[PDB]
Amino acid sequence: LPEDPRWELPRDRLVLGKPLGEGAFGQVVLAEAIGLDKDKPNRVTKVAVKMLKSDATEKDLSDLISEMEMMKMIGKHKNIINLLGACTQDGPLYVIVEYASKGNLREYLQARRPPGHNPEEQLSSKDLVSCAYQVARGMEYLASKKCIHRDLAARNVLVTEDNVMKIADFGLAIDYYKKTTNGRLPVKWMAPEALFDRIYTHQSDVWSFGVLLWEIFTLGGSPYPGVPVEELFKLLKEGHRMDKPSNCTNELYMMMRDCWHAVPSQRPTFKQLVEDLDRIVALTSNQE
Ligand SMILES: CCOc1cccc(-c2ccc3c(NC(=O)c4ccccc4)n[nH]c3c2)c1
Ligand SMILES: [Cl-]
């Protein structure tokens, strides 16, 4: 492949470590980058490295290269997983991205549920809304760069050591029965027009963002538990809408319902959700 000197890091500057994301995002490993910043060559940064598996096909390689090229195009934001570099020359392709040490948002929320399980950390109402605000800001950035996610879900949001929310897996462009690493059905986050008419827009990502809000306020709850694909289809045709979680305000439930508008044009934009969530954070108590 051609050397892009914007992004090239010498192979000997990368110390590869243990695997990370359960295989969900392909072969991803924790690594240490020496002198990632040309400005600071004696500093190590923990990073995530994506590479090809042993029995990888030509398409598999094509998908990895495509994903990296998209991330250069999309550019940098606080609330997305950012490209940091690549090892393209003289060995296997390595794509180097930001490391989020507290894992996906579903895991992060579940680990901070109140005791039954005795957790070491607990989240205020302000913390939950702040999570929602950060995802909305990342999505507003990606939409502004004309990027449609197509799988927005707490499982595709990663949390850093500093509790920053980062949208992942936005750079890649369908078996309705295939389940997640965790055993859930991705069709349960899809807008009806995406599910039935294969039409994917920023508006269908807002619908997914509605399901993600529901995941946040249930602290990593599973949408439509025990509902198979055929029954989900009937629920959507009948216009079913999930119940309001306990410990969720009328205002946040109405935001969820607005994200789930049957008419795509009538859903709020991510620009609108960022403004509304900004106001709500400032007015939400951190005392419980
Ligand atoms: C070039 C495409 O790179 C991609 C694509 C899709 C996902 C990722 C990715 C996956 C996982 C991570 C990650 N951290 C983790 O996966 C993780 C998991 C459990 C416990 C602690 C950390 N930090 N950064 C990542 C980036 C990288
Ligand atoms: Cl999940």
Tab-separated table of all heavy atoms in Angstrom, residues 106 155 180 182 184 189 215, ligand 2:
chain	number	residue	atom	x	y	z
A	106	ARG	N	-22.508	0.343	27.452
A	106	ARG	CA	-23.415	-0.685	28.035
A	106	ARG	C	-22.712	-1.325	29.246
A	106	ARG	O	-23.324	-1.365	30.326
A	106	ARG	CB	-23.794	-1.767	27.024
A	106	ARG	CG	-24.713	-2.830	27.619
A	106	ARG	CD	-24.823	-4.133	26.847
A	106	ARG	NE	-23.583	-4.553	26.213
A	106	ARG	CZ	-22.654	-5.345	26.743
A	106	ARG	NH1	-22.780	-5.838	27.969
A	106	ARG	NH2	-21.579	-5.631	26.029
A	155	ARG	N	-23.309	-0.060	22.809
A	155	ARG	CA	-22.201	-1.029	22.533
A	155	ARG	C	-21.154	-0.396	21.607
A	155	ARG	O	-19.995	-0.872	21.640
A	155	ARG	CB	-22.708	-2.345	21.923
A	155	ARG	CG	-23.231	-2.245	20.494
A	155	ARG	CD	-23.848	-3.537	19.947
A	155	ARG	NE	-24.768	-3.226	18.846
A	155	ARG	CZ	-26.084	-3.072	18.979
A	155	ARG	NH1	-26.667	-3.242	20.152
A	155	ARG	NH2	-26.823	-2.733	17.939
A	180	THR	N	-25.359	-9.882	18.758
A	180	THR	CA	-24.118	-9.223	19.243
A	180	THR	C	-23.311	-10.231	20.070
A	180	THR	O	-23.891	-11.251	20.487
A	180	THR	CB	-24.436	-7.986	20.096
A	180	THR	OG1	-25.226	-8.421	21.203
A	180	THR	CG2	-25.171	-6.897	19.345
A	182	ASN	N	-22.866	-9.902	23.002
A	182	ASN	CA	-23.630	-9.913	24.280
A	182	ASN	C	-24.956	-10.688	24.145
A	182	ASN	O	-25.613	-10.866	25.172
A	182	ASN	CB	-23.877	-8.478	24.760
A	182	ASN	CG	-24.447	-8.397	26.162
A	182	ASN	OD1	-24.018	-9.122	27.058
A	182	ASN	ND2	-25.408	-7.507	26.362
A	184	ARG	N	-27.695	-9.833	21.997
A	184	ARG	CA	-28.861	-8.975	21.625
A	184	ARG	C	-28.939	-8.838	20.099
A	184	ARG	O	-27.927	-9.107	19.425
A	184	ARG	CB	-28.764	-7.596	22.280
A	184	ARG	CG	-28.786	-7.612	23.801
A	184	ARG	CD	-28.537	-6.210	24.312
A	184	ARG	NE	-28.448	-6.066	25.760
A	184	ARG	CZ	-28.193	-4.916	26.381
A	184	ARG	NH1	-27.992	-3.802	25.681
A	184	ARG	NH2	-28.141	-4.880	27.705
A	189	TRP	N	-32.405	-1.505	17.344
A	189	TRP	CA	-31.995	-0.074	17.336
A	189	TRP	C	-32.365	0.609	16.005
A	189	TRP	O	-32.127	1.813	15.883
A	189	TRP	CB	-30.492	0.068	17.607
A	189	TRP	CG	-30.079	-0.166	19.029
A	189	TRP	CD1	-29.696	0.794	19.920
A	189	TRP	CD2	-30.003	-1.416	19.739
A	189	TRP	NE1	-29.365	0.225	21.116
A	189	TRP	CE2	-29.530	-1.126	21.037
A	189	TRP	CE3	-30.243	-2.755	19.404
A	189	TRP	CZ2	-29.318	-2.112	22.009
A	189	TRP	CZ3	-30.028	-3.729	20.361
A	189	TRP	CH2	-29.581	-3.410	21.642
A	215	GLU	N	-31.322	3.057	26.771
A	215	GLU	CA	-30.225	2.228	27.345
A	215	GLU	C	-29.550	2.972	28.495
A	215	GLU	O	-29.269	2.329	29.527
A	215	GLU	CB	-29.140	1.895	26.324
A	215	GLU	CG	-29.593	1.000	25.202
A	215	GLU	CD	-28.408	0.622	24.335
A	215	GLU	OE1	-27.741	-0.391	24.656
A	215	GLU	OE2	-28.143	1.358	23.356
B	2	CL	CL	-25.611	-4.660	23.253
